[PDB]
Amino acid sequence: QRMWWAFLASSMVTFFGGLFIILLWRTLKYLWTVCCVGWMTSVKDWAGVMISAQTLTGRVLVVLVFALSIGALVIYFIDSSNPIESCQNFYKDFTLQIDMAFNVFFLLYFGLRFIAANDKLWFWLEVNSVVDFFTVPPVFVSVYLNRSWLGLRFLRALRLIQFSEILQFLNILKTSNSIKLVNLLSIFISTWLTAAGFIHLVENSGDPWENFQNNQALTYWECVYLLMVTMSTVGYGDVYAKTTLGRLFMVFFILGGLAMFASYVPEIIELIGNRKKYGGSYSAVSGRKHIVVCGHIT
Amino acid sequence: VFALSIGALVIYFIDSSNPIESCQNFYKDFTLQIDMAFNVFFLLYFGLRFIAANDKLWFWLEVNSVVDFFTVPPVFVSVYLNRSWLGLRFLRALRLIQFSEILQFLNILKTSNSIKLVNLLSIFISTWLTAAGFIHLVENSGDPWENFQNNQALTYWECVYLLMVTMSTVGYGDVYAKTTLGRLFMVFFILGGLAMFASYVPEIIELIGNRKKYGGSYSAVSGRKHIVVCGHITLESVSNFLKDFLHKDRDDVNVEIVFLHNISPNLELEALFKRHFTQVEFYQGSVLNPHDLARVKIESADACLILANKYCADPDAEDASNIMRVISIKNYHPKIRIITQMLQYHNKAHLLNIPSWNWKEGDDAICLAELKLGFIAQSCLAQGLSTMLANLFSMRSFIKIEEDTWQKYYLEGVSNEMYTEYLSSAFVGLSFPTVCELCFVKLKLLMIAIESRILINPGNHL
Amino acid sequence: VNLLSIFISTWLTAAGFIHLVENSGDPWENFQNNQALTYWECVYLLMVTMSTVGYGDVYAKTTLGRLFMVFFILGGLAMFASYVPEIIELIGNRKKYGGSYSAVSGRKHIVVCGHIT
Amino acid sequence: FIWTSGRTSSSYRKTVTALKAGEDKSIRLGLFLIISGVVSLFIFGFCWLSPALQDLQATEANCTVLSVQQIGEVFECTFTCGADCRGTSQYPCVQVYVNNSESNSRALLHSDEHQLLTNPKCSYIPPCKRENQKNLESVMNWQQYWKDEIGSQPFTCYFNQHQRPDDVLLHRTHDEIVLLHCFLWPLVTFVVGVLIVVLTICAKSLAVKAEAMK
Amino acid sequence: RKTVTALKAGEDKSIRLGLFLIISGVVSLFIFGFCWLSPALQDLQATEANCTVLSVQQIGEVFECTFTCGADCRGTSQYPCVQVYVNNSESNSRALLHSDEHQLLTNPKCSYIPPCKRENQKNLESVMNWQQYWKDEIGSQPFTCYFNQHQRPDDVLLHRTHDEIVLLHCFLWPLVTFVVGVLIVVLTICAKSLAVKAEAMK
Numbered sequence A: 001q002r003m004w005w006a007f008l009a010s011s012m013v014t015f016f017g018g019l020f021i022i023l024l025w026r027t028l029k030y031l032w033t034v035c036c037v038g039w040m041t042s043v044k045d046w047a048g049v050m051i052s053a054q055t056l057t058g059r060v061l062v063v064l065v066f067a068l069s070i071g072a073l074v075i076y077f078i079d080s081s082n083p084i085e086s087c088q089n090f091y092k093d094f095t096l097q098i099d100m101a102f103n104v105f106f107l108l109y110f111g112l113r114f115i116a117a118n119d120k121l122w123f124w125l126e127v128n129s130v131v132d133f134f135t136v137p138p139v140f141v142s143v144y145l146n147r148s149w150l151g152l153r154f155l156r157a158l159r160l161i162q163f164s165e166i167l168q169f170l171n172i173l174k175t176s177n178s179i180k181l182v183n184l185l186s187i188f189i190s191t192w193l194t195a196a197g198f199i200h201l202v203e204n205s206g207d208p209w210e211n212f213q214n215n216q217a218l219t220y221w222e223c224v225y226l227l228m229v230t231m232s233t234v235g236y237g238d239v240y241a242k243t244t245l246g247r248l249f250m251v252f253f254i255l256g257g258l259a260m261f262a263s264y265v266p267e268i269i270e271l272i273g274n275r276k277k278y279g280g281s282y283s284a285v286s287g288r289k290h291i292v293v294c295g296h297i298t
Numbered sequence B: 001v002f003a004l005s006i007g008a009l010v011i012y013f014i015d016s017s018n019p020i021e022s023c024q025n026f027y028k029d030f031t032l033q034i035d036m037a038f039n040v041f042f043l044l045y046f047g048l049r050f051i052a053a054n055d056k057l058w059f060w061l062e063v064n065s066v067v068d069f070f071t072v073p074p075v076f077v078s079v080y081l082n083r084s085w086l087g088l089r090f091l092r093a094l095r096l097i098q099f100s101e102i103l104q105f106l107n108i109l110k111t112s113n114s115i116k117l118v119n120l121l122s123i124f125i126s127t128w129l130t131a132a133g134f135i136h137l138v139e140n141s142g143d144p145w146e147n148f149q150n151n152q153a154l155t156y157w158e159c160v161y162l163l164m165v166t167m168s169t170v171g172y173g174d175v176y177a178k179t180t181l182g183r184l185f186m187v188f189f190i191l192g193g194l195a196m197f198a199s200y201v202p203e204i205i206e207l208i209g210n211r212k213k214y215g216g217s218y219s220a221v222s223g224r225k226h227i228v229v230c231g232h233i234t235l236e237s238v239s240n241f242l243k244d245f246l247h248k249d250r251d252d253v254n255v256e257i258v259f260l261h262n263i264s265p266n267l268e269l270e271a272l273f274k275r276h277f278t279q280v281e282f283y284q285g286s287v288l289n290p291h292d293l294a295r296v297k298i299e300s301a302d303a304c305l306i307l308a309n310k311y312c313a314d315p316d317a318e319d320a321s322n323i324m325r326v327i328s329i330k331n332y333h334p335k336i337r338i339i340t341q342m343l344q345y346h347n348k349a350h351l352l353n354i355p356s357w358n359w360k361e362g363d364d365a366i367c368l369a370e371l372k373l374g375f376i377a378q379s380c381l382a383q384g385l386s387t388m389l390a391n392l393f394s395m396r397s398f399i400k401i402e403e404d405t406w407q408k409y410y411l412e413g414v415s416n417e418m419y420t421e422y423l424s425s426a427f428v429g430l431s432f433p434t435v436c437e438l439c440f441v442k443l444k445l446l447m448i449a450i451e452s453r454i455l456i457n458p459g460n461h462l
Numbered sequence C: 001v002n003l004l005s006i007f008i009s010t011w012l013t014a015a016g017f018i019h020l021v022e023n024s025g026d027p028w029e030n031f032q033n034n035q036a037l038t039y040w041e042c043v044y045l046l047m048v049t050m051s052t053v054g055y056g057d058v059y060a061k062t063t064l065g066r067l068f069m070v071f072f073i074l075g076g077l078a079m080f081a082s083y084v085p086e087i088i089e090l091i092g093n094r095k096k097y098g099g100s101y102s103a104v105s106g107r108k109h110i111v112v113c114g115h116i117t
Numbered sequence D: 001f002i003w004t005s006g007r008t009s010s011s012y013r014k015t016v017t018a019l020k021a022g023e024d025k026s027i028r029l030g031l032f033l034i035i036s037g038v039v040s041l042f043i044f045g046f047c048w049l050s051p052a053l054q055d056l057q058a059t060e061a062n063c064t065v066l067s068v069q070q071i072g073e074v075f076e077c078t079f080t081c082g083a084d085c086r087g088t089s090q091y092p093c094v095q096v097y098v099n100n101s102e103s104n105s106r107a108l109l110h111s112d113e114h115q116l117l118t119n120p121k122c123s124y125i126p127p128c129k130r131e132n133q134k135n136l137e138s139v140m141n142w143q144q145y146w147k148d149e150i151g152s153q154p155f156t157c158y159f160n161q162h163q164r165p166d167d168v169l170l171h172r173t174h175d176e177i178v179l180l181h182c183f184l185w186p187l188v189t190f191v192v193g194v195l196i197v198v199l200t201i202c203a204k205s206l207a208v209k210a211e212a213m214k
Numbered sequence E: 001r002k003t004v005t006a007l008k009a010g011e012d013k014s015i016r017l018g019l020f021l022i023i024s025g026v027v028s029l030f031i032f033g034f035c036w037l038s039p040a041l042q043d044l045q046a047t048e049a050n051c052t053v054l055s056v057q058q059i060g061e062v063f064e065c066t067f068t069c070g071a072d073c074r075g076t077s078q079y080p081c082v083q084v085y086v087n088n089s090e091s092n093s094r095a096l097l098h099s100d101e102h103q104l105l106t107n108p109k110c111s112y113i114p115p116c117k118r119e120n121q122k123n124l125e126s127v128m129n130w131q132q133y134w135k136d137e138i139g140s141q142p143f144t145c146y147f148n149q150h151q152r153p154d155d156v157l158l159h160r161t162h163d164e165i166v167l168l169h170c171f172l173w174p175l176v177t178f179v180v181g182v183l184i185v186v187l188t189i190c191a192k193s194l195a196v197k198a199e200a201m202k
């Protein structure tokens, strides 16, 4: 028996049940009018300070988030080399225990950002909330079931979008050029890796109307290379999508990914290399005089 | 018309999965009856547009007339013959060109950006689908000089994918045209379709995503006061203001700061607001707009601060702009405390004639020229007094270094500011000199004055 | 007219040269690696190469053919990228609001001019 | 790079508070789910159309075997061994001919449509298990179990006089469950999208009534 | 001069169309002419002849035909090879008979191919049927045949592979496009110039 749907159901149920609970609470709050500084604000302020880097504990938490995002991405990269669905012992799988701990920390960081949030519904629809709903619940389900599906785990790469924000929190990024460069690099890499993971999932699991018989055995790095070739418009043709869903995804990505590549790669290359050629200072020579000339130089 | 165009396109999409020519019973084919009715409606809509036309010959040569001549008669022939050919039925996709026009008729599309976006999307999609249908027809029916033997069995969606790959210039080579007519069509499409793709896809992506990041409005918090700041907002102006407002030498104030400005903040201002994430909020709007003033909740703000551009090219223009801002804020809410910077003194006199301008309630016009010339005059009574006064306002921490230099002593002196607070009943009934010599080093506090209200250095008789 | 003439003549001449070079093989290979390519096939290959589509169904295989392909990729893509947009801009410069009003018997009409916005 | 240097780069009431922005984002989401559900329904509908008609056009029948025999010829199956390891092994060909309910004439039995399409010249294929001896043993085992089935029990069979004109199948190759899920979950997406819009408008309009009440 | 009303714009669009049809017809004539050139010369260069069979025999070797079964289903079946040799009107020497140019090109080693009908037995039966009908045709009636000493140097055909009707339609309808384009220009100029005379008459 296969269990792929249990992981996916846990994410869908989490995202939409939370959204419906929030909307029902709103509805019923106003409906009570038909029948008819606080500690809440103090904990909201404390959570907002923790979320920012205004304290030592907040800085430690932000650095931990930065490290654990890369850790989870590396864990997904390790798992991407295995079969699509498998049975594996939680008590004897160090990577599953490490993932379990990482997702505990992300659940806690999610809880802190929820408490700190001003508009809950606005928070529930912030995309790094969506990234947590589509990546945290399936880890819990896997650790409970003693089984894993390599399903939507490529969405972990979207965690790189917050890197510039948490670098600005840590008082590291100050200049506009550096901020823009980090933003562009993060968006480019996360988009590339996420799209590669999705096309990897879709190619390795065939079309349902073809009874999953036309699947193509493509590795994650092969899909990454194919996406790079497609984005740059080189189009070698050695590697390409063959399933109907894969090609349907390829068509929608060709509209967005080429505009991203054509826009971001020149701008990144302009932002880098902005070095001053004439820097440094003169070194005096003993026994030889020197003359400084300034004013109208042409 | 809008619905039936999509209906006919969907009918063509269904038929594109069948053989190229076939016999099918009109009395037992629901899709052929539905197509029959759809084409009756298009014949009627054609007749109405013909009657409404001014120049008939101009109408006969309008391309949606041509699209009807190439799509309506063959449906009639098919319904008469009890047979169908998947011939020029892909021209149905050209019906999407009129979508923007009939949306403008229905008073739905009004803005230029939305009209342009709809036009570009319609032209792109209709061109793509029509070209895909034509290459599908040409590939599935081979070359006449090769006796139709070199035909390639390509599905319509396969041809759509091939056209997308060709337009974007990716050119995988997994799917390509093989017939001579198919390649001849490919060569002419490569000239036009790449120029369309290269032009339209960036422009569509620019038209979408034009969202305002700083929208919304401030949400007041019970038990906590907030302050609205407007006027000259820039990275250095906000950075200097926040250093003095949020300094650790004040007591534990939790006044929120809300900025209102009509320019989107640059990346360095957004980073400055992120470094103050729990104490500063920014909202993009105009102080002259009552909607924006309601957005920043200025009716419940504790005060409104209006910073001025001290280095402006036209002091008169800057004063006029600040006067207009004050007028707008007072007009929205007469009972709002307003603190503003005024470059000149005659413009300050102009401003204080406002009916809602109440200096007793706390309206302060900080006149820069007046205060600076007064400070210069006090330096003429005692040299160094301008420095003495200026350092009493700026919030400064103690700074200490091991070097024995004049700077150490100077910084130790600079560490003090002027404050104001109520004093103990244990000092009521004594003389002002007596409480001064008491406070001086026992409490470590120096008094310049007390609240016949404001009295500068009282005598021994008070 | 200048752009169209230069584009077409360059395209056809380059296609003929690559057709000659592909159909007569390499002298160091003793003319044994020749590829039987028709002139129209070479024209299609040149169009595919110029537009940067690069299907790969048809391509040069001889050493001289590839050496010619490398030098043409430098010039022909810059020509295509420059000329095709400029030609497409030059065409289609039609005035949408031309023509003249046609009076209707029994109905009056009013002409409005000046500051129209 | 699409365009070399961008084609030479010379040729290319407001009483509601902050909650308004979260609610307008909730409308957006609910609308996007409505569009997604409808679009995916059409996409899956075009993909399932030919398989579903090729399945529907095949009628159920009652069958009985006329004969079981070998044609003496042999064919390659592929056998597998981890990573990518494969080789080929022979199997002997059986043919089986069967009584038919629509044409009442000879047709050749094919266990399923994948067997028909992988070797239309032959009636059965063994799962390739290394050596030729095990393939022949497994064909002889299936052959003996089919040869004595003479009118024992008219087993049901699937036929299509328009595209399997003298070929017969023992199974449907179209899983009803997989099709059901392909049309159910896009419908669920659409219903969820409607409920999100409805609750967002219900909350938005009740906020105005609860404001005017004060 | 601009006495004509709005009708001027419809008539200038009608001139455009008529000119575009003239250009289309001429361009398509050249395009079809280049595509038909090699097939038409390869057909013209093959002369009509009178033939008689020298012998009918099998070479003992067998070949694959492909047999088909809906969607994409195909497999292969053997057929036995006949060869047939024939008297010739241009070279007066041995040549091998090939029923048509597609048979010559699909298997130039062999004289006939059966339409693949599933099993080998039906292919062999259909070859034996054709073989027996050809073996007794000895001088019975000098059947006409097609030959080309320059590109079918010892090969002979029973049929022309070039349909005259398909070529006729490929050159007729571009000519019709051109004639219609001329008549549209002519009637548009005739209407435009008579409108000026009917205006000056008032």
Ligand SMILES: CC(C)CCC[C@@H](C)[C@H]1CC[C@H]2[C@@H]3CC=C4C[C@@H](O)CC[C@]4(C)[C@H]3CC[C@]12C
Residues within 6 Å of the ligand: A006, A007, A009, A010, A013, A014, A137, A141, A145
């Ligand atoms: C508290 C909320 C967020 C939990 C999220 C819902 C998830 C966890 C729910 C939804 C459907 C549930 C699954 C439904 C069916 C099975 C199969 C059974 O053999 C073990 C339990 C298991 C595997 C359930 C595990 C929990 C589950 C996956």
Ligand SMILES: CC(C)CCC[C@@H](C)[C@H]1CC[C@H]2[C@@H]3CC=C4C[C@@H](O)CC[C@]4(C)[C@H]3CC[C@]12C
Residues within 6 Å of the ligand: A017, A018, A021, A022, A025, A026, A118, A119, A120, A121
């Ligand atoms: C975590 C998921 C599953 C449940 C979400 C909890 C929901 C039902 C509850 C818990 C606390 C509630 C929030 C408490 C405070 C506010 C601030 C007010 O100005 C708007 C409503 C809002 C935002 C409430 C909305 C509903 C709410 C978010």
Ligand SMILES: CC(C)CCC[C@@H](C)[C@H]1CC[C@H]2[C@@H]3CC=C4C[C@@H](O)CC[C@]4(C)[C@H]3CC[C@]12C
Residues within 6 Å of the ligand: B054, B055, B056, B057, E007
């Ligand atoms: C539908 C096809 C078959 C026939 C079209 C009808 C023909 C015969 C007739 C009917 C109505 C006529 C039009 C009626 C009115 C005008 C306006 C006038 O100032 C010039 C002639 C013009 C433009 C006529 C042209 C010819 C015309 C279009």
Ligand SMILES: [Ca+2]
Residues within 6 Å of the ligand: B249, B395, B396, B397, B398, B414, B415, B416, B417
């Ligand atoms: Ca101090």
Ligand SMILES: [K+]
Residues within 6 Å of the ligand: A232, A233, A234, B168, B169, B170, C051, C052, C053, D001, D002
């Ligand atoms: K390219």
Ligand SMILES: [K+]
Residues within 6 Å of the ligand: A233, A234, A235, B169, B170, B171, C052, C053, C054
């Ligand atoms: K390419």
Ligand SMILES: [K+]
Residues within 6 Å of the ligand: A233, A234, A235, A236, B169, B170, B171, B172, C052, C053, C054, C055
């Ligand atoms: K390519």
Ligand SMILES: [K+]
Residues within 6 Å of the ligand: A235, A236, A237, B171, B172, B173, C054, C055, C056
């Ligand atoms: K290629």
Ligand SMILES: [Mg+2]
Residues within 6 Å of the ligand: B277, B278, B279, B280, B281
């Ligand atoms: Mg706040």
